[PDB]
Design a protein around this ligand. Structure first.
Ligand code: SF4
Ligand code: F3S
Length: 77
């Protein structure tokens, strides 16, 4: 699944939320998040996101797997 990290923080809007075939981009405190368990590993968002700030959950550094687990948290519990 393609999940948030860090470079998106407070950086612009749009060009991700509108593209997703399963609408699973939702809001966080500052930046948006993505439910990774819903995300069907389609990419797309990948291509439009500047420098792919949306990174695949295991390309995502262990440090930022915290955020993946956060995006999960948000929509699980
Ligand atoms: S990879 Fe596709 S399914 Fe997943 S969040 Fe991005 S646009 Fe949505
Ligand atoms: S920068 Fe953030 S606004 Fe979307 S296009 Fe990337 S997740």
């Amino acid at each position: 699944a393609y999940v948030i990290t860090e470079p998106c923080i407070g950086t612009k809007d749009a060009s991700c939320v509108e593209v997703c075939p399963v609408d699973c981009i939702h809001e966080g405190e500052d930046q948006y998040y993505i439910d990774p368990d819903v995300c069907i590993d389609c990419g797309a968002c990948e291509a439009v996101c500047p420098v792919s700030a949306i990174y695949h959950e295991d390309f995502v550094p262990e440090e930022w797997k915290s955020y993946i687990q956060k995006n999960r948290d948000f929509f699980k519990k």
